[PDB]
Amino acid sequence: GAMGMLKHISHGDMNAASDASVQQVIKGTGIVKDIDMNSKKITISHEAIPAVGWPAMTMRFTFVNADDAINALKTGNHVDFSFIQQGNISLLKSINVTQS
Ligand SMILES: [Ag+]
């Protein structure tokens, strides 16, 4: 059949929102340096993240649930991630592999 559904392809009609569950979810980047699903800690050598105000250091991030991203995640991989600060505990919400 002739499938030609005239939708707003014109990127300017903002009907969809990029936000949903962003409660100041602090985003950053760095190279994964270790993954421990057992204690749910992922030690990532992370860069200067100005959103939290932390310099380029190696530190572990606690995740709530092992996602498909976290499953396909490997050490040595340069990634961009998103977490929320909880005292000293950096609670990893989501993680994106940008360079493997
Ligand atoms: Ag740190």
| Cα R_g (the chain), whole angstroms | 17
Contact predicate 96/83, CB 8 Å: no
Contact predicate 100/48, CB 8 Å: no
Method: NMR
Expressed in angstroms and rounded, the spacing between residue 59 Cα and the centre of ligand 1 is 5
Q: How many residues does the chain have?
A: 100
Contact predicate 32/79, CB 8 Å: yes
Q: Tell me the C-alpha distance between 99 and 74, whole Å.
A: 11
Expressed in angstroms and rounded, the spacing between residue 77 Cα and the centre of ligand 1 is 17
Q: Tell me the C-alpha distance between 89 and 29, whole Å.
A: 17
Instruction: CATH number for 26-95: choose from 2.40.30.10, 2.60.40.1180, 2.40.50.320, 1.10.3720.10.
Output: 2.40.50.320
Expressed in angstroms and rounded, the spacing between residue 52 Cα and the centre of ligand 1 is 10
CA torsion sign for 16, 19, 21, 27 is: positive
Q: What residue ranges do the domains of the chain occupy?
A: 26-95
Contact predicate 32/44, CB 8 Å: yes
Expressed in angstroms and rounded, the spacing between residue 40 Cα and the centre of ligand 1 is 16
